[model samples]
Target: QYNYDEVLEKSILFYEAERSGRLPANNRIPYRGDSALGDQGNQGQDLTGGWYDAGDHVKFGFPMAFATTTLAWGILEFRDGYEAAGQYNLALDSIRWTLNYFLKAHVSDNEFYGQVGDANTDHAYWGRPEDMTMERPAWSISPSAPGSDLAAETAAALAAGYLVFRDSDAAFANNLLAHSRTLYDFALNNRGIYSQSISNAAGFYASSAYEDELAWGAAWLYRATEEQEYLDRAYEFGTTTNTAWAYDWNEKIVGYQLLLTTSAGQTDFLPRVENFLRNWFPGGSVQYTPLGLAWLAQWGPNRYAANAAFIALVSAKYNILASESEQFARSQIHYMLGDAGRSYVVGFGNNPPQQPHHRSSSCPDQPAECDWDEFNQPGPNYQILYGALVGGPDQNDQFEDLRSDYIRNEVANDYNAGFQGAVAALRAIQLRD
Candidate 1:
């Protein structure tokens, strides 16, 4: 049988390796071996922390905030998994790393450097972050140039992170809560897509809208502060006057539903949340592959499944058709493990992806030339990328394990955020037995 314990370890380690800014004392990775220098942006405003967004080297705040929010939410809801797996402190440290960097990003009450490093420039290079010499430009938004989506999503992350540490460190939690409230207010007052305010973000993580983030931030703030105004604002913006396909980088309606339905006095939102949940199940509207994978996109098939699993798992906690919801969650998670006849997570099980489309793992150890050929002509990666889940198979369950197929093989911070939480949920349930 596969060791769920090791699965937990590697998934957590992925965050360590992906860490930026000053490395942690117990850091175990070798790449980007140096520290205290990666923050060479924002006119020396010290924009020096957060995880590299993906297989690439850019630190996209939009998705990074979403990923952090997901991880923190998992820790808050599924601490039992961390306890049973003996990863309680490990999980806390991981969540705090991103939140601390977020604090750096939130430089002022109205200013936040939402992005650092140019995507095209960063993507052009294929070396460790320590060796990079390209100009990393920083971008931000203020009250004059509003970016409600980015500010609110980031607030949501910090607010949830504050909860994770509320008991452990009250001072830190209060500080985080303070920042969260300020950022939420900024979003409430300012209304516009962040990508539009920061034009560079448009070509990359272009948000569909800012309404969902406004509601998401307020919903989290209400839970954190127990303030009625927060709840009022949440519903005011959370109403389903609009719809989105999936809750990925730009969408948060699904997340709003999950958060709102889980809390008390939120029964008014339960019907809509349940409706959204039912839409993704077996008989629901979503089209599934023969192997039972929800075919969202060939780019990252497992992401959709993993995200759905997270949502369903949370719904089960509310006893919302517990059996059916859990079954759906299990179906998605098991499919990722090996149910479709192969593992999507690298370095995990039989026939797992050998050559993932990642720069660090693809290259030979330092001092060795990492060129285009090293990237293109690949067998297995030079080093084992443990617990790194690939982009996943096509809609038909067909997967190509080539290093160049980033759409199918690249591992990403946002990609694994919800997936890791889903893994913890299952592990906790199994261990509880």
Candidate 2:
């Protein structure tokens, strides 16, 4: 059997490398420094902390919020796994980095900054974040340009953060819950897709719909407060008929339904969750790579597989298709670990990816120039992005360790979010047996 505990520990460490803003003395990524310290909104609201959106320097709010909420959910559900692996505090710190940034971005009761640093400009540079000298502009959303998806996803992250920190830090927990409530209300009253309002985000990480997020935020709030009103609102905003293909940064129908099923005793949603998971199983709707990966989408195949594996593990925890879900989860996760002949996680198992499409990791030590030349260099990334999950192989299980292949080799915050959670679930199962 693979070392699930080791993978869980390394997965938590991956977030440390993605962190922006000020660095702590004990920071693990030696190549990283205190960068993006000047990130701020139009009104100078001090928007200086959070994880970078992907291999790029942009701090995209929509995906960042989703990643944080997913991480917090894993921590809350499989805390025993984190504790057993000695990563409980480290995991808390990982999510806190993003949660604190969300607090800074929520400039008012009705307004929130949804993005910092334009993608076009950020993508033009291929160097360390510490060496950046481009103009970093912030984007916000309000009643005039409402973003229910961004606001509600942020609300879900805060609500989940509150639950995770309530026992450890009371004051922080209270603040998170307060902001969560306000953001949820903001999302409820003003409805619009975030990418449409924040035009800069449309080209990347565009939202498909906001209704799922409204229900997602409400479901998380209900879980945090046990309030009947939030549950009622979740049902009002939620859907029971639509089945999700994958639970990811853009989709939350499966996630909200799963929460309602487990947290609120809404067993009616179980069928929906099962239907979704069934599609990922072998002989189901999702196609399988020759090497046995549950290939879902061309972009981030590993991410989609890991996310489905997470839902499967969570389903098993609730005794919904228990044995089958566990077996399916194990198959997918193990394939990513090494059963596919090589590990998809950076710096982990047999023949892991050495050239992930990440800028910071690609650059050499400071004082040396890093630009298009470095990006084109046919060598491994200077910094080993430990625990980062790369976009996986294609339908035929074909993969290359090239830095330019963003579709198959890039690593991102959202990519690792559910992957880490699924690993923790496996670790928890390891300890149980």
Q: Cα miss at 73, model 1 (Å)? A: 0.8
What TM-score would every model get versus the actual structure? 0.96, 0.99
Going through the candidates in order, what is the number of backbone clashes in each? 0, 0
Q: Model 2 compared with the native: what TM-score?
A: 0.99
Model 1 vs. true fold: TM: 0.96
| Model 1 worst lDDT run, 10 consecutive residues | 32-41
Per-residue lDDT for 1-433 in model 2, tens only?
A: 7887778778877888888899989988888899998999887789998999889999999999999999999999889888998888999999999999999999999999999998999998888899888999999999999999999999999999999999999999999999999999999999999999999999999999999999999999999999999999998989899899899999999999998998788977888998988888887899988879998878999999999998888888888887988888899989889997899999899999999999988888877788888889998988888898999998999998899898999899999898898888888988888
lDDT accuracy of residue 25 in candidate 2: 91
Point out the worst 10-residue segment of candidate 2 by lDDT: 4-13
> lDDT tens digits, residues 48-141, model 1?
8788888777788999999888888888877888788887788888878888888888888988888888888888888666667888888888
Best by TM-score: 2
Candidate 2: residue 410 lDDT (0-100): 83
Residue pairs with backbone atoms closer than 3 Å in model 2 (clashes): none
